[PDB]
Design an enzyme around this catalytic site. Structure first.
Site, PDB file in Angstrom:
ATOM      1  N   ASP B 379      13.014 -29.141  24.145  1.00 13.32           N
ATOM      2  CA  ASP B 379      13.387 -29.000  22.747  1.00 13.32           C
ATOM      3  C   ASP B 379      12.634 -27.817  22.143  1.00 13.32           C
ATOM      4  OD1 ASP B 379      14.473 -29.436  20.257  1.00 13.32           O
ATOM      5  OD2 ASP B 379      13.165 -31.130  19.758  1.00 13.32           O
ATOM      6  N   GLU B 474      11.435 -27.447   1.635  1.00  9.99           N
ATOM      7  CA  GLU B 474      11.259 -27.450   0.186  1.00  9.99           C
ATOM      8  C   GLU B 474       9.792 -27.610  -0.190  1.00  9.99           C
ATOM      9  OE1 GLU B 474      13.803 -30.364  -1.553  1.00  9.99           O
ATOM     10  OE2 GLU B 474      15.640 -29.217  -1.200  1.00  9.99           O
ATOM     11  N   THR B 654      18.269 -25.212  21.619  1.00  9.93           N
ATOM     12  CA  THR B 654      17.870 -24.730  20.305  1.00  9.93           C
ATOM     13  C   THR B 654      18.918 -25.109  19.268  1.00  9.93           C
ATOM     14  OG1 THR B 654      16.751 -22.857  21.358  1.00  9.93           O
ATOM     15  CG2 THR B 654      17.154 -22.708  18.996  1.00  9.93           C
ATOM     16  N   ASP B 773      10.605 -34.564  21.324  1.00 12.53           N
ATOM     17  CA  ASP B 773       9.942 -35.268  20.237  1.00 12.53           C
ATOM     18  C   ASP B 773      10.994 -35.794  19.273  1.00 12.53           C
ATOM     19  OD1 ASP B 773      10.684 -32.770  19.013  1.00 12.53           O
ATOM     20  OD2 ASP B 773       9.164 -33.124  17.467  1.00 12.53           O
ATOM     21  N   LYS B 968      -8.786 -40.204  63.444  1.00 10.39           N
ATOM     22  CA  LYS B 968      -7.623 -39.519  62.889  1.00 10.39           C
ATOM     23  C   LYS B 968      -7.739 -39.386  61.376  1.00 10.39           C
ATOM     24  CE  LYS B 968      -3.591 -37.579  62.981  1.00 10.39           C
ATOM     25  NZ  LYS B 968      -3.406 -36.246  63.613  1.00 10.39           N
ATOM     26  N   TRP B1042      -4.963 -28.688  68.245  1.00 11.52           N
ATOM     27  CA  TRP B1042      -3.754 -28.267  67.547  1.00 11.52           C
ATOM     28  C   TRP B1042      -4.055 -27.873  66.106  1.00 11.52           C
ATOM     29  CZ3 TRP B1042       0.544 -26.028  67.284  1.00 11.52           C
ATOM     30  CH2 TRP B1042       1.426 -26.229  66.218  1.00 11.52           C
ATOM     31  N   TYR B1054      -1.294 -22.186  51.892  1.00  9.65           N
ATOM     32  CA  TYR B1054      -2.493 -22.931  51.539  1.00  9.65           C
ATOM     33  C   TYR B1054      -3.534 -22.903  52.649  1.00  9.65           C
ATOM     34  CZ  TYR B1054      -0.354 -26.724  54.274  1.00  9.65           C
ATOM     35  OH  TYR B1054       0.220 -27.478  55.271  1.00  9.65           O
ATOM     36  N   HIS B1055      -3.131 -22.654  53.897  1.00 10.37           N
ATOM     37  CA  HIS B1055      -4.111 -22.482  54.965  1.00 10.37           C
ATOM     38  C   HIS B1055      -4.985 -21.252  54.757  1.00 10.37           C
ATOM     39  CE1 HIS B1055      -1.918 -25.592  57.152  1.00 10.37           C
ATOM     40  NE2 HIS B1055      -2.872 -25.577  58.066  1.00 10.37           N
TER      41      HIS B1055
END
Ligand SMILES: CCCCC/C=C/C/C=C\C/C=C\C/C=C\CCCC(=O)O[C@H](COC(=O)CCCCCCCCCCCCCCCCC)COP(=O)(O)O[C@@H]1[C@H](O)[C@@H](O)[C@H](OP(=O)(O)O)[C@@H](O)[C@H]1O
Ligand SMILES: *[C@@H]1O[C@H](CO)[C@@H](O[C@@H]2O[C@H](CO)[C@@H](O[C@@H]3O[C@H](CO)[C@@H](O)[C@H](O[C@@H]4O[C@H](CO)[C@@H](O)[C@H](O)[C@@H]4O)[C@@H]3O)[C@H](O)[C@H]2NC(C)=O)[C@H](O)[C@H]1NC(C)=O
Ligand SMILES: *[C@@H]1O[C@H](CO)[C@@H](O[C@@H]2O[C@H](CO)[C@@H](O)[C@H](O)[C@H]2NC(C)=O)[C@H](O)[C@H]1NC(C)=O
Ligand SMILES: *[C@@H]1O[C@H](CO)[C@@H](O[C@@H]2O[C@H](CO)[C@@H](O)[C@H](O)[C@H]2NC(C)=O)[C@H](O)[C@H]1NC(C)=O
Ligand SMILES: *[C@@H]1O[C@H](CO)[C@@H](O)[C@H](O)[C@H]1NC(C)=O
Ligand SMILES: [Mg+2]
Lengths: 350, 1064
Positions: B379, B474, B654, B773, B968, B1042, B1054-1055
Site C-alpha cells: 500500500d 482539513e 496507489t 494498514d 554428523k 566431501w 555463501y561458501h
C-alpha cells in the site's frame, strides 16, 4: 507496561561462538596425525591377534567316515590349526561303540608348542538360528528362578512345549529342549610318554546366570521332562532324576542365546598350568545328530588375546582408516600444490 | 420477532436470551478430549502409529514390548495438548481482559446509574454510554446530551469507511435527560431476529402515548465508536453472538506452506519404501520357511496353517519397521517454529520506539516462508507514507510562498510572470501595510483557511487548542492557516470565530449555510456574512473542476495558478483550489429558497442538494491554491531498493492518478530515470486489449537483453485494471506483468485490492506478501500467503488480522533478508537431519533379517529404541533449527542476492531427501558389517573365556549408531555456541552415564531383564572402547572429505561469503 524486549546476548542472537573453517593447513595435519596414531594401533592389534594359537576339528560325520579298528587320518578339509611351530603328524580319528549304541568319536592331535596361556575348549555349531524370534523368547524366566508355577500361569511364549499329558513340563521352552548334549572327555588323555591335562568344567557361565539360575522347588510327580530329554530321563522325573539348574552349568551356557548362526559355546577350560608339547586325545560321546539342523559341529581348542582370538577385523579397520587418511593427505596436497584454487576473490558471483 | 422490555431486567429474562460474554477460546475443561483426539488423529502419522499400536496387541506378533510405541504416542500427544492449552490460556487471558470492562447501567431498585461489568449486562437494561469508548452491544438510542439528539459514530472496526455517520434520536422520546424521569416510561420494542445484515433494521417501539417505527438511522452497532457526544442513553437488544456484526464471524483459513507439501511428499516416499521393505522381508521369510522345512525342525513350526503363518509374519515386520516414520518430527517442527517466532518477535531492530509496538508474529506456522517471497503487494497511504498531513505551500495572487526555500530555484528569474519560491516573511511584509492591492485577497484567503472548514475546536488546560476534523487534510489546512496569526477558536452554532494574532482582536462571521462534500463534484461551498454588511461565498475544490467556471476578464493570475498546480502535482502534493464571490441579498434569498425546496425533498439528497448549491455556482473569483504534503517513512527508499536488488517484484497499489504515482514512485526509488514505463490508461476495453497485444508483441518480437529485462516497469489505472482482470484478458496482463520489475496500480478500488492478489496465486507458483494498514485492505492481508499489518492512525483493524504485525516498513529489510534466509535454512536442515538419524539406526533392523532366517528379531532392546527418539537425539535438531546461523547478519544484508538461494529452493527438496536417506543407509550398513566382523562367534572378550551374546552386541550397535549420528550433527553445524555443546557432547555423555544406571537398576523391577550382566561384558571389555573409536571415523571420513572438497575446489556464493566472514 513497557513492551521493549531486553538487550542481552541471548534475546538478540548475539552469543559468542566459533566458526569451523576447513583450511588445508588445518585439515592435512589432522589427516597425517590420524594416520600416525592409527598405524601403530593397527599393527599392535594385528600382532596381538597373530600370537593366538588355536585348533579346530570338524568331528561331524564321524559316525560315517571314521574307521573303527585303527586311527586313520582326518581329511584336510576338516582340520584347522594355527601354532607357533610346524605340526609333524596330522590329526587322526577313530570310532567306538559300547552298549545300546553309545557311539563315541576319539580324536588324536599333536600340540607342538608349549602353550603358556590358559586353554579353553568350545563346541562350534553352524546353521543354528538361535537368534530366531520364535526361539529367543521361548523360555519361562520364573522357573529359572525355581518356583512351582501352576499350569494356567505358565509363560505362553513356550507354547509348543507346554503342559504335556496334563503335567507341567518343568523346563518350558525351545532353548532347553534343543540342548546340545555331546559329552566331552573333560581331560586330554596324553599318549606316548605324555601326561594327561585335566580341565575344569565349572565357572564357565556368566555370574548373573549362576546367581539367577536357582535350584528348582518343584516336586517329581507333577512335572515331566521335555520331549527331547526322555532318553536320559525315562519313566519321567523322580526324587533323584530331578536335576538342579543351579549346578548344571552347561545348561546355563546353552541358555545364553547367541546372535549369529555361527557361534561358540564354552565347555572346558584350564588356567592353572601350561599345556606342554605332545600327542593328546579327546573323546566325544556323539549324541547330537547334525541332521536336526544341517550344520557342522566342531571341537575348538583356543586361547585368549587382547581382542579375542585369531581375528584381524579391528586391525584391518584401523589400517584401512590410516591408509585412506594417508592417501587423501597426499592427493589433496599435490592437488593444491600443482594447481591452487585461484578463486579466493568473490568476483561478484551473485 | 424479538420483544424486549424497556426497564424490566426480570421480565425479559424469561425468554432466555444469550449472555454478553464473548468467548474466543478453542478448548475448554468440559469437552477437551472429544475434539483434541479427533484433531490429533486427523493427520497421517498419528493415525498410522495408532493402527500400529492396535496391531501390536495381538499375541506372538510384537517383536518388542507391547507398550514400546503407545508410550511415545502418549508422550507426543500430551506435549501437543499442553502446547494447545498454553496457547488457549494466552488467548483467554486477553479475552477475559476485554470481557470484564466497566459499564454504567441503570438500576430499577436504586433508580440511578451504577457501575457493573460487561458479563452481567442483560438485554433490556438502560445504559449510559460516554464518549471515546466502544459500543457495548446493539443498543437503541433513548436520549443524549445534544438538544436535537444526534451523535457521531465511526465504523473503523465494522466497515472500511473512515467517515462519521450521524445517528439521530427520536424527537418524541429524546426529552428524558435526568435519571429520575426514566421510571415513568413503559413499553416494548419489537425488533427483528439476529442476522448478519449491517444497514437493514426494522422494529416498533411502544411509548407512553403512541408507538413509533424503527430504522437503522437510530441504531448503533457494536463495532462502531462514539465520537463528539457527551453521553447517550441506550437500550440493549442484541448481545453476545446475537448481534449483527459478531453473528457471522469470519474464520481465518489455515495457510499451508510449500515446506508442508514437500514434507507430505517425503512422508509418502517413506511409506512406499516401508511397504517395499516389509514385502521383501515377508517374501524372503515365506520362501525360506518353505524351502528349509527340514533343517528348522527344532522350532516346531505349524505346517498345515503356514498360509496363516504368512499373515502373522507380515505384521511382525510392520511393527519392526514402523519406526521408519518418526512421529517426534511433527512436534519438533512446530516447536522449532514456535521458538523461531518468539526469537523473531523480540528483536530490537524490529521494535518501534515512538509508539511502543514490537513485532508480533500472530501465526507461527508461516515463519519459513519469509525466506522465499517473490511478490510484494504493498500500500501507499499508510504503508509508504506517514499518513499525517502537513500544510506545505500556498499560492495566491499569482505568487508562491514556502517556509523551506530550496536553493534550486529560490532566485526568481521573472521570465514574464513571476515564477519562483518565496518565504512567508515576504508575505507578512507585503500584508501588514494595506498599500498593496493583493492584501484584501490575502485576508480573504487567510479567513477562508479558518472559516470554510468544518473542524471542531477543543480547549485544554495547557492552552494548546486541539482540532477535530473528519479528514486530516482539513486539519492540516487549519493548522497551516492558524500558525501565522489567524487561529480558529471556539465555534458556536451558525457562526465562526477567528482570533487574529496580528491585531490581537477576535472577529466573528455569521455562517449562513454550508454544502456537504461530494465525490463527483469534489467541491464544497459555504456562505458567510461579515460585520461590514457584505455577503461572501467561499468555495473549495479540485484543480480540474472549479477552474472551468471562472471569469477570465476579472482574474489576471490564471496561468500562474495553473503553473503552481502543475509544478506541485509533479511532486505528489495534494492540491486544493479556493475561490470566493460577493453576492447580494436578492440572490441570497433565492438561494435560500432553493435550499429549502431541496431540503423539503428528503428522497433525493445526493443530486438535489448538489444541484441546489450549483444553481448559484455559475461564476466564481479564484483566490488561489494550497498544497499539502505527505512524507514517506524513514528508510523506505532504502528498503525498497534493497528488496529490488534481492530479486523481488513490487506491486504498489496507489490511490493517486498516473503522474502523481509515477513521481512518488521515482522519489521512493522504486523506478528510475531510465525505466521504460509501459503506460496503460484507457477506458475502452477493446483499446486496452489492443494495448496489451502491442506490448506483448513488441516484447516477444526481439530477445530480452540483460540490461533490457532488468529495466522495465508497468503502470495501469483503475478502470483498465478492472477490464484487464476478466477471465478472457487476465493472461495478457499476467504475462506482461511477469516481465517488468515494478508495477504501479493507480486509482485502485478498495475491494479490487484483493482481486489483484487472488488472481496471481491462482495462476502462479510464487509466494505472496501483502503488507498494509487500515481496514480498507484487510481482505488483501487475508488473501496473500504472508500478511503484514502496520500500526497506524487508521485503526488496529489490520494488525489484529495480519499474520505479522510490524510497526513500520523499514523493518522489512531485516524481516526477510535475515529473519527469512535463516528461518528457511534452519528448519530445512532441522527436517532432513530428522530423517537421517532415524534411518541410521532402525535400518540395522533390516540388514539383520539376513542372519536370523528372516524371522524379525530385534537387534536392540525394546525400551532403548523408544528412548532413542526422546532423550538422546532431541536437542541437536532444536539447536540446528533455532540457534544456528549459516551466515552473519552483517554480511546477509550487504549481499541481498543470497535471498535468491532461499527464493528458488536450494535447501529443501526431495532430491536432497533421497541423498540423506541413502547416506543413512550407507552408515547403517557400515556399522552393521563392522559389528558383525568383530562379534564373529561372540568370541571377542578377554574375561576368563566368557563369550558375548545378542544384547551385548546390540548395545555396541546402538552406541556406535548414536555416536555417528552426533558426529554428523557436529559436521552439519556452523555456529559453535554453548547450546551446541549441550546438545551434541551433552547428549553423548548423557547416554554414556544413563546406560549403566538404567541397566543396573531397572532389570530388578521386571522392566528390562535382557540387560543382566551386560554392563560388565560391554564396558569392561577392551574391544568396546576400540570399535567405538574405529567405526565412527571410518563412517564419517566420507562426509569430512566431501565437505572439504566442496568447500575448497567447488565452492558456492555463501561458501566464499563465510570465508570472507571468517578471515575479515
Ligand atoms: C571396504 C570398502 C571401503 C569403501 C569405502 C568407500 C567410501 C566412500 C563410498 C562411496 C562414496 C563415493 C564417492 C565419494 C565422493 C563424492 C560423494 C558425493 C556425495 C554427494 O554429492 O551427495 C551427497 C550424498 O552423499 C551420499 O549419500 C553418499 C552415498 C554413499 C552411498 C553408497 C551406496 C549405498 C551403499 C550401501 C551398501 C550396502 C551393501 C549391503 C551390505 C549389508 C548387507 C547385509 C549429498 O549429501 P551431503 O550431506 O554431502 O550435502 C552437502 C553437505 O551437507 C555439505 O558438505 C555441503 O556444504 P559444504 O560442502 O560447502 O560445506 C552442502 O552444500 C550439501 O551439498
Ligand atoms: C540328545 O539330543 C538329541 C536331540 O535333541 C536327542 O535325539 C532325539 O531324542 C528324542 C527323545 O527320544 C527323539 O524323540 C523320540 O523319537 C522316537 C523315535 O525315535 C519317538 O517314538 C518318540 O515319540 C514317542 O511317542 C510316544 C507316544 O506318543 C511317547 O510315549 C514317547 O515318550 C515318545 O515321546 C520321540 O518323538 C528324537 O527322535 C531324537 N532325534 C531328534 C533328531 O530329535 C537325543 O535323544 C539326546 N540324547 C540324550 C542322551 O539326551
Ligand atoms: C589344569 O591343568 C593342570 C595340568 O595338568 C592341572 O594340574 C594337575 O592336577 C592334577 C590333579 O589331578 C595333579 O595330579 C597334577 O600333578 C597337576 N599337574 C601339575 C604339573 O602339578 C590342574 O589341576 C588343572 N586345573 C583344573 C583341573 O582345574
Ligand atoms: C585328573 O586326571 C586324572 C587322569 O585322567 C583323573 O583320574 C581319572 O579319574 C576318573 C574319574 O573317576 C577315573 O575314572 C579314571 O580311572 C582316573 N584315571 C587315572 C589314571 O587315575 C582325575 O580324576 C583328574 N582329576 C580330577 C579332579 O578329576
Ligand atoms: C509337592 O507335594 C505335593 C505333591 O507331591 C503338593 O501338595 C505340593 O504342593 C507340591 N509342592 C510343594 C512346593 O510342596
Ligand atoms: Mg493505507
Amino acid at each position: 507496561t513497557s513492551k521493549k524486549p531486553p538487550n542481552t546476548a541471548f534475546r538478540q542472537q548475539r552469543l559468542k561462538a566459533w566458526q569451523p573453517i576447513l583450511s588445508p593447513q588445518s585439515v592435512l595435519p589432522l589427516l597425517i596425525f590420524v594416520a600416525c596414531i592409527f598405524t601403530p594401533i593397527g599393527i599392535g592389534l594385528i600382532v596381538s591377534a597373530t600370537k593366538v594359537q588355536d585348533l579346530t576339528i570338524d568331528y561331524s560325520h564321524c559316525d560315517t567316515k571314521a574307521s573303527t579298528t585303527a586311527f586313520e587320518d582326518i581329511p584336510k578339509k576338516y582340520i584347522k590349526y594355527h601354532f607357533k611351530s610346524k605340526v609333524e603328524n596330522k590329526p587322526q580319528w577313530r570310532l567306538t561303540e559300547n552298549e545300546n549304541g553309545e557311539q563315541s568319536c576319539e580324536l588324536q592331535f599333536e600340540i607342538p608348542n608349549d602353550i603358556k596361556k590358559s586353554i579353553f575348549i568350545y563346541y562350534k555349531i553352524t546353521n543354528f538360528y538361535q537368534n530366531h524370534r520364535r526361539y529367543v523368547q521361548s523360555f519361562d524366566t520364573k522357573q529359572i528362578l525355581g518356583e512351582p508355577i501352576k499350569k494356567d500361569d505358565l509363560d505362553t511364549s513356550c507354547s509348543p512345549i507346554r503342559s504335556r499329558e496334563d503335567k507341567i513340563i518343568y523346563p518350558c521352552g525351545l532353548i532347553a529342549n534343543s540342548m546340545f548334549n555331546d559329552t566331552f572327555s573333560q581331560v586330554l588323555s596324553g599318549i606316548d610318554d605324555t601326561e594327561d591335562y585335566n580341565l575344569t568344567n565349572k565357572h564357565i557361565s556368566w555370574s548373573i546366570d549362576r546367581h539367577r539360575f536357582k535350584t528348582t522347588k518343584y516336586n517329581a510327580s507333577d512335572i515331566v521332562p521335555p520331549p527331547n530329554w526322555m532318553k536320559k530321563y525315562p519313566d519321567g522325573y523322580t526324587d533323584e532324576n530331578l536335576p538342579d539348574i543351579h549346578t548344571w552349568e552347561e545348561f546355563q551356557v546353552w541358555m545364553r542365546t547367541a546372535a549369529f548362526p555361527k557361534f561358540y559355546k564354552l565347555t572346558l577350560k584350564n588356567e592353572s598350568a601350561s599345556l606342554p608339547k605332545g600327542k593328546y586325545q579327546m573323546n566325544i560321546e556323539l549324541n547330537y545328530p547334525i541332521s536336526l539342523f544341517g550344520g557342522t559341529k566342531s571341537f575348538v581348542l583356543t586361547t585368549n588375546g587382547a581382542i579375542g582370538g585369531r581375528n584381524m577385523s579391528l586391525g584391518v579397520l584401523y589400517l584401512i582408516v590410516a591408509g585412506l587418511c594417508a592417501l587423501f593427505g597426499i592427493i589433496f596436497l599435490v592437488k593444491l600444490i600443482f594447481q591452487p584454487r585461484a578463486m579466493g576473490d568473490h568476483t561478484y558471483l551473485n | 420477532p424479538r420483544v424486549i422490555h424497556i426497564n424490566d431486567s426480570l421480565a425479559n429474562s424469561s425468554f432466555g436470551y444469550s449472555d454478553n460474554h464473548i468467548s474466543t477460546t478453542k478448548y475448554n475443561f468440559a469437552t477437551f478430549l472429544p475434539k483434541f483426539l479427533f484433531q490429533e488423529f486427523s493427520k497421517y502419522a498419528n493415525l498410522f502409529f495408532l493402527c500400529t499400536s492396535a496391531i501390536q496387541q495381538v499375541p506372538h506378533v510384537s517383536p518388542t514390548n507391547r507398550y514400546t510405541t503407545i508410550g511415545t504416542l502418549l508422550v507426543v500427544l500430551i506435549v501437543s495438548a499442553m502446547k494447545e492449552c498454553i496457547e488457549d490460556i494466552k488467548r483467554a487471558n486477553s479475552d477475559k481482559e476485554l470481557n470484564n470492562s466497566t459499564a454504567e447501567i441503570f438500576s430499577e431498585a436504586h433508580d440511578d446509574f451504577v457501575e457493573k461489568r460487561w458479563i452481567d449486562i442483560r438485554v433490556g437494561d438502560i445504559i449510559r454510554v460516554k464518549s471515546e469508548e466502544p459500543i457495548p452491544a446493539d443498543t437503541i438510542i433513548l436520549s443524549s446530551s445534544e438538544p436535537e439528539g444526534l451523535c457521531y459514530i465511526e465504523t473503523a472496526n465494522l466497515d472500511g469507511e473512515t467517515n462519521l455517520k450521524i445517528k439521530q434520536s427520536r424527537v418524541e422520546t429524546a426529552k428524558f435527560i435526568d435519571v429520575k424521569t426514566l421510571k415513568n416510561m413503559n413499553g416494548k420494542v419489537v425488533s427483528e431476529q439476529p442476522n448478519s445484515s449491517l444497514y437493514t433494521y426494522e422494529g416498533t417501539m411502544t411509548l407512553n402515548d403512541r408507538q413509533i417505527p424503527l430504522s437503522p438511522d437510530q441504531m448503533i452497532l457494536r463495532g462502531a465508536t462514539l465520537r463528539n457526544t457527551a453521553w447517550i442513553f441506550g437500550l440493549v437488544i442484541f448481545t453476545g453472538h446475537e448481534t449483527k456484526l459478531l453473528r457471522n464471524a469470519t474464520a481465518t483459513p489455515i495457510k499451508r506452506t510449500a515446506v508442508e507439501k514437500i514434507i507430505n511428499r517425503q512422508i509418502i516416499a517413506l511409506f512406499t519404501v516401508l511397504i517395499v521393505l516389509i514385502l521383501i522381508s515377508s517374501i524372503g521369510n515365506v520362501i525360506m520357511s518353505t524351502a528349509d522345512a527340514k533343517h528348522l525342525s527344532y522350532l516346531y513350526l505349524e505346517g498345515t496353517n503356514k498360509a496363516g503363518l504368512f499373515f502373522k509374519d507380515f505384521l511382525t515386520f510392520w511393527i519392526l519397521f514402523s519406526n521408519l516414520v518418526p512421529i517426534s518430527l511433527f512436534v519438533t517442527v512446530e516447536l522449532i517454529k514456535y521458538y523461531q517466532a518468539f526469537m523473531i518477535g523480540s528483536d530490537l531492530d524490529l521494535y518501534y520506539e515512538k509508539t511502543d509496538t514490537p513485532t508480533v508474529v500472530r501465526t507461527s506456522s508461516l515463519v519459513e516462508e519469509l525466506g522465499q517471497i517473490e511478490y510484494i503487494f504493498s500500500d501507499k497511504t499508510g504503508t509508504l507514507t506517514r499518513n499525517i498531513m502537513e500544510f506545505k505551500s500556498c499560492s495566491i495572487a499569482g505568487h508562491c510562498y514556502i517556509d523551506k526555500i530550496p536553493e534550486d530555484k529560490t532566485a526568481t528569474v521573472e521570465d514574464g510572470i513571476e515564477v519562483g519560491y518565496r518565504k512567508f516573511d515576504d508575505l507578512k511584509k507585503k500584508l501588514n501595510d494595506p498599500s498593496d492591492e493583493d492584501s484584501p485577497i490575502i485576508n480573504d484567503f487567510l479567513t477562508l483557511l479558518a472559516t470554510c472548514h468544518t473542524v471542531i475546536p477543543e480547549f485544554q488546560s495547557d492552552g494548546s487548542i486541539k482540532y477535530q476534523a473528519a479528514s486530516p487534510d482539513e486539519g492540516a489546512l487549519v493548522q497551516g492557516g492558524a500558525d501565522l496569526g489567524y487561529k480558529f477558536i471556539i465555534r458556536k452554532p451558525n457562526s465562526v470565530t477567528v482570533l487574529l494574532e496580528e491585531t490581537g482582536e477576535e472577529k466573528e462571521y455569521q455562517l449562513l449555510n454550508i454544502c456537504e462534500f461530494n465525490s463527483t463534484r469534489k467541491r464544497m461551498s459555504a456562505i458567510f456574512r461579515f460585520p461590514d454588511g457584505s455577503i461572501k461565498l467561499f468555495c473549495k475544490g479540485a484543480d480540474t473542476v472549479i477552474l472551468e467556471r471562472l471569469d477570465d476578464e476579472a482574474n489576471q493570475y490564471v496561468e500562474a495558478t495553473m503553473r503552481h498546480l502543475e509544478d506541485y502535482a509533479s511532486e505528489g502534493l495534494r492540491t486544493l483550489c479556493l475561490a470566493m464571490r460577493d453576492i447580494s441579498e436578492g440572490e441570497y434569498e433565492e438561494w435560500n429558497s432553493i435550499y429549502n425546496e431541496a431540503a423539503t425533498t428528503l428522497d433525493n439528497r445526493a443530486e438535489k442538494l448538489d444541484e441546489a448549491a450549483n444553481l448559484i455556482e455559475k461564476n466564481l473569483i479564484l483566490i488561489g491554491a494550497t498544497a499539502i504534503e505527505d512524507k514517506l517513512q524513514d528508510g523506505v527508499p532504502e528498503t525498497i531498493h534493497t528488496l529490488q536488488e534481492a530479486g523481488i517484484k513490487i506491486w504498489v497499489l496507489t490511490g493517486d492518478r498516473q503522474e502523481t504515482a509515477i513521481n512518488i514512485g521515482m522519489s521512493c526509488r522504486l523506478l528510475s530515470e531510465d525505466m521504460n514505463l509501459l503506460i496503460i490508461n484507457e477506458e475502452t476495453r477493446d483499446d486496452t486489449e489492443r494495448n496489451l497485444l502491442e506490448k506483448i508483441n513488441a516484447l516477444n518480437e526481439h530477445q530480452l537483453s540483460t540490461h533490457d529485462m532488468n529495466t522495465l516497469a508497468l503502470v495501469i489505472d483503475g478502470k483498465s485494471l478492472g477490464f484487464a482482470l476478466e477471465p478472457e484478458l487476465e493472461d495478457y496482463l499476467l504475462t506482461v506483468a511477469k516481465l517488468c520489475k515494478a508495477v504501479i496500480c493507480c486509482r485502485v478500488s478498495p475491494l479490487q485490492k484483493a482481486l489483484v492478489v487472488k488472481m496471481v496465486k491462482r495462476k502462479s507458483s510464487s509466494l505472496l506478501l501483502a503488507i498494509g494498514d487500515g481496514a480498507n485492505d484487510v481482505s488483501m492481508i487475508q488473501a496473500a500467503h504472508v500478511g503484514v499489518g502496520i500500526s497506524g492512525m487508521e485503526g488496529m483493524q489490520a494488525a489484529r488480522s495480519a499474520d505479522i504485525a510490524v510497526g513500520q516498513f523499514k523493518f522489512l529489510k531485516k524481516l526477510l533478508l535475515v529473519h527469512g534466509s535463516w528461518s528457511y535454512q534452519r528448519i530445512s536442515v532441522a527436517i532432513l537431519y530428522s530423517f537421517y538419524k532415524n534411518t541410521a539406526l532402525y535400518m540395522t533392523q533390516f540388514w539383520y533379517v539376513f542372519a536370523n532366517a528372516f524371522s524379525g528379531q530385534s537387534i536392540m532392546e525394546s525400551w532403548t529404541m523408544s528412548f532413542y527418539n526422546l532423550f538422546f537425539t532431541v536437542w541437536p535438531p532444536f539447536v540446528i533449527g533455532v540457534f544456528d546461523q549459516f551466515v552473519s547478519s552483517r554480511l546477509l544484508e550487504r549481499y541481498p542476492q543470497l535471498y535468491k538461494l532461499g527464493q528458488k529452493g536450494q535447501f529443501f527438496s526431495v532430491y536432497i531427501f533421497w541423498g540423506w536417506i541413502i547416506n543413512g543407509f550407507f552408515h547403517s550398513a557400515i556399522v552393521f558389517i563392522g559389528t558383525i566382523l568383530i562379534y564373529r562367534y561372540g568370541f571377542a572378550l578377554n574375561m576368563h573365556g566368557e563369550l558375548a551374546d545378542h544384547w551385548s552386541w546390540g548395545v555396541t550397535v546402538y552406541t556406535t549408531s548414536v555416536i555417528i549420528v552426533l558426529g554428523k550433527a557436529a559436521l552439519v553445524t556452523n555456529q559453535w555456541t554453548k547450546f551446541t555443546l549441550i546438545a551434541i557432547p551433552g547428549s553423548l555423555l548423557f547416554w554414556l552415564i544413563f546406560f549403566p544406571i538404567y541397566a543396573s537398576i531397572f532389570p530388578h523391577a521386571n522392566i528390562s531383564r535382557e540387560y543382566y550382566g551386560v554392563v560388565k561384558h560391554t564396558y569392561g571389555s577392551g574391544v568396546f572402547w576400540l570399535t567405538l573409536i574405529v567405526l565412527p571415523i571410518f563412517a564419517l571420513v566420507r562426509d569430512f572429505l566431501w565437505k572439504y572438497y566442496k568447500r575448497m575446489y567447488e565452492p558456492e556464493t555463501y561458501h566464499v561469503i563465510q570465508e570472507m566472514q571468517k578471515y575479515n
